[PDB]
Amino acid sequence: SKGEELFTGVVPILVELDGDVNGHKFSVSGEGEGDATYGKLTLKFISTTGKLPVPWPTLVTTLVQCFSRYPDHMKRHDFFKSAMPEGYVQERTISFKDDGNYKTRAEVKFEGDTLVNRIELKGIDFKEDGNILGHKLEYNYNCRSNVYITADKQKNGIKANFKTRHNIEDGSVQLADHYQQNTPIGDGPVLLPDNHYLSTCSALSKDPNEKRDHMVLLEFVTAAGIT
Numbered sequence: 614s615k616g617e618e619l620f621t622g623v624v625p626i627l628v629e630l631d632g633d634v635n636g637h638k639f640s641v642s643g644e645g646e647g648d649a650t651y652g653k654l655t656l657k658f659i660s661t662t663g664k665l666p667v668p669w670p671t672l673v674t675t676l677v678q679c680f681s682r683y684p685d686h687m688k689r690h691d692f693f694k695s696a697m698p699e700g701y702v703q704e705r706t707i708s709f710k711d712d713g714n715y716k717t718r719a720e721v722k723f724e725g726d727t728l729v730n731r732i733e734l735k736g737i738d739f740k741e742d743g744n745i746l747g748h749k750l751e752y753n754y755n756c757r758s759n760v761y762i763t764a765d766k767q768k769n770g771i772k773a774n775f776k777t778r779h780n781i782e783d784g785s786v787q788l789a790d791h792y793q794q795n796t797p798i799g800d801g802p803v804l805l806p807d808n809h810y811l812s813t814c815s816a817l818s819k820d821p822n823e824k825r826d827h828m829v830l831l832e833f834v835t836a837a838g839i840t
């Protein structure tokens with residue numbers, strides 16, 4: 614695609630999220646860069662308004678799959694880059710097992726040289742002393758995720774589903790079921806993929822000099838499941 618040529622080098626990234634979970638309003642700003650050649654993302658997120666009402670690890674998937682490394686033989690399956698620069702809408706429902714749900718709507722596109730992810734997140738039905746509002750999740754991401762992608766030809770887009778598992782402080786796990794839909798914003802041709810998945814590996818850390826509430830993410834994502 615024309616779009617894939619925008620990703621041959623290191624690209625600056627901005628992320629902006631506005632959130633409301635059970636009426637608790639918050640906002641996140643992120644900055645970093647992506648290097649799709651190696652499937653590599655480095656991002657730092659800062660909580661900028663109301664006290665973060667949910668654990669940082671529950672926002673990782675919401676807070677740019679256009680930075681996935683598609684092997685050469687799988688390049689015809691890369692919807693995400695093909696929709697650039699005009700971008701795509703990415704929507705999800707994230708169902709937290711025995712707890713509430715997030716509904717997210719994001720637009721991912723270039724603004725000049727910079728790849729931007731603008732997100733609205735709405736969470737409802739969360740339990741007051743559950744793992745999310747109770748802040749009972751460990752600050753880590755100890756489980757890899759396979760993001761299973763299929764074409765959605767009717768909307769000239771894709772759908773995905775996957776499970777993420779977040780460690781609870783007692784040693785147990787909080788499951789998050791994700792259903793995802795992406796559709797192009799622009800009128801250029803896009804790539805409709807064969808079934809495949811993104812193998813996604815994330816690591817969270819803290820900047821020791823940062824006193825604001827924040828999250829540092831290092832993430833490697835590789836398309837797979839086609840030989």
Ligand SMILES: [Mg+2]
Pocket residue numbers: none
């Ligand atoms: Mg209700």
